[PDB]
Design an enzyme around this catalytic site. Sequence first.
Site, PDB file in Angstrom:
ATOM      1  N   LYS A 120       0.331  -1.033   0.143  1.00 18.38           N
ATOM      2  CA  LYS A 120      -0.040   0.089  -0.010  1.00 18.38           C
ATOM      3  C   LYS A 120       1.085   1.037   0.042  1.00 18.38           C
ATOM      4  O   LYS A 120       1.594   1.427   0.816  1.00 18.38           O
ATOM      5  CB  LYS A 120      -1.480   0.061   0.891  1.00 18.38           C
ATOM      6  CG  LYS A 120      -2.101   0.769   1.259  1.00 18.38           C
ATOM      7  CD  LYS A 120      -2.631   1.430   2.733  1.00 18.38           C
ATOM      8  CE  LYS A 120      -4.297   1.604   2.156  1.00 18.38           C
ATOM      9  NZ  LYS A 120      -4.944   1.394   1.433  1.00 18.38           N
ATOM     10  N   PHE A 162      -0.998 -10.864   1.785  1.00 20.23           N
ATOM     11  CA  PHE A 162      -2.144 -10.654   1.329  1.00 20.23           C
ATOM     12  C   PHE A 162      -3.427 -12.100   1.100  1.00 20.23           C
ATOM     13  O   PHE A 162      -3.239 -12.684   2.087  1.00 20.23           O
ATOM     14  CB  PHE A 162      -1.071 -11.097  -0.178  1.00 20.23           C
ATOM     15  CG  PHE A 162      -1.729 -11.248  -1.302  1.00 20.23           C
ATOM     16  CD1 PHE A 162      -2.573  -9.673  -1.781  1.00 20.23           C
ATOM     17  CD2 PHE A 162      -2.716 -12.668  -2.030  1.00 20.23           C
ATOM     18  CE1 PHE A 162      -3.125 -10.421  -3.295  1.00 20.23           C
ATOM     19  CE2 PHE A 162      -3.430 -12.680  -3.128  1.00 20.23           C
ATOM     20  CZ  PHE A 162      -3.603 -11.568  -4.192  1.00 20.23           C
ATOM     21  N   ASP A 208     -14.364   3.218   8.482  1.00 22.08           N
ATOM     22  CA  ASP A 208     -14.924   3.774   7.157  1.00 22.08           C
ATOM     23  C   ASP A 208     -14.471   1.453   6.860  1.00 22.08           C
ATOM     24  O   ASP A 208     -14.576   1.482   5.774  1.00 22.08           O
ATOM     25  CB  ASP A 208     -13.814   3.839   6.283  1.00 22.08           C
ATOM     26  CG  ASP A 208     -14.277   4.491   4.982  1.00 22.08           C
ATOM     27  OD1 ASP A 208     -15.376   4.717   4.801  1.00 22.08           O
ATOM     28  OD2 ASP A 208     -13.378   3.938   3.918  1.00 22.08           O
TER      29      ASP A 208
HETATM   30  C1  DTQ Z   1      -7.558 -10.955  -4.536  1.00 18.87           C
HETATM   31  O1  DTQ Z   1      -7.378  -9.315  -4.008  1.00 18.87           O
HETATM   32  C2  DTQ Z   1      -7.542  -8.836  -2.909  1.00 18.87           C
HETATM   33  C3  DTQ Z   1      -6.590  -9.149  -1.907  1.00 18.87           C
HETATM   34  C4  DTQ Z   1      -6.139  -8.372  -0.624  1.00 18.87           C
HETATM   35  N1  DTQ Z   1      -4.640  -9.073   0.185  1.00 18.87           N
HETATM   36  C5  DTQ Z   1      -4.427  -7.755   1.633  1.00 18.87           C
HETATM   37  N2  DTQ Z   1      -5.213  -6.380   1.529  1.00 18.87           N
HETATM   38  C6  DTQ Z   1      -6.080  -5.920   0.736  1.00 18.87           C
HETATM   39  N3  DTQ Z   1      -6.062  -4.856   1.134  1.00 18.87           N
HETATM   40  C7  DTQ Z   1      -6.235  -4.147   1.494  1.00 18.87           C
HETATM   41  C8  DTQ Z   1      -4.843  -4.038   2.820  1.00 18.87           C
HETATM   42  C9  DTQ Z   1      -5.014  -2.856   3.835  1.00 18.87           C
HETATM   43  C10 DTQ Z   1      -5.542  -1.477   3.953  1.00 18.87           C
HETATM   44  C11 DTQ Z   1      -6.375  -1.921   2.497  1.00 18.87           C
HETATM   45  O2  DTQ Z   1      -6.518  -0.425   2.468  1.00 18.87           O
HETATM   46  C12 DTQ Z   1      -6.333  -2.582   1.749  1.00 18.87           C
HETATM   47  C13 DTQ Z   1      -5.946  -6.613  -0.622  1.00 18.87           C
HETATM   48  C14 DTQ Z   1      -7.780  -6.403  -1.287  1.00 18.87           C
HETATM   49  C15 DTQ Z   1      -8.158  -7.356  -2.542  1.00 18.87           C
HETATM   50  O3  DTQ Z   1      -9.170  -7.109  -3.089  1.00 18.87           O
HETATM   51  C16 DTQ Z   1      -9.177  -5.973  -3.496  1.00 18.87           C
END
Ligand code: DTQ
Length: 283
Positions: free
Chosen positions: A33, A76, A121
Amino acid sequence: MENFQKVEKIGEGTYGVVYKARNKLTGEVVALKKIRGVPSTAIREISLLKELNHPNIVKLLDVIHTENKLYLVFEFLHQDLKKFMDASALTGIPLPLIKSYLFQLLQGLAFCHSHRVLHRDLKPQNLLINTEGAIKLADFGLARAFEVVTLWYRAPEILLGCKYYSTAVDIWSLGCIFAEMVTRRALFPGDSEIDQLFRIFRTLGTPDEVVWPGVTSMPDYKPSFPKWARQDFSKVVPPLDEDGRSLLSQMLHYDPNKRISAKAALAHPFFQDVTKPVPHLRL
Ligand SMILES: COc1cc2ncnc(Nc3cccc(O)c3)c2cc1OC
């Protein structure tokens, strides 16, 4: 950012873009991120979240602060709840699974709330699931540390201008998600703050000093708001049994102080027969 081989862009968030990435070193797949100098306060706040571990919270693996840039490395997960709900649109999510996900989410919130950490949120896109039947909350705590923006899960007190919201705002959002999973239609799909507020009022009734002491003194409250009557919950969420409906109504009480807490919700009769089934996921 040099140690990661960005695979795909997983999507933009309230605080940045998330990518599926491979750690060139470890070879592990993670969620990277990129936060949109970085305030020291935020730095310290983030570091705090790193020690907040729980089975139902997306694990924050590393905080990369280099070249005055901020990247967060999260574990993930397999899929997000919104995509899962869409894939289940024709038959809906089986109740045993809905009950399982709600139970786990409440455990996650009870944990965050006990450490005084709010989400602020929650939305289906922020909820992640895996093949094992688990569900986790993502974005927890980023609101504090740091066009078409969905307002569907926002609590009434936030829409009315309250500046000091509580943990109760998360319970409201979860209540909305719960209803959506059951009926397969968003509960309050407003397109603007006032439209959102009026959709809430049209279903639950326009609040007053009787059901919500202090409401008429909220910053954005207007004496000119229309007066709508409350509808029957049997009409709002038809397929849900009475235990489900009683729990939902307690999650959607107008007064944040009367709204059920995550801890107390975990002891509701609805979870008496809770199990942990495995979802059929198409990855
Ligand atoms: C297989 O797809 C996905 C796998 C994901 N794996 C981990 N985190 C995500 N997102 C996340 C972690 C921290 C903050 C934030 O804003 C968003 C993910 C979102 C996915 O799809 C949208």
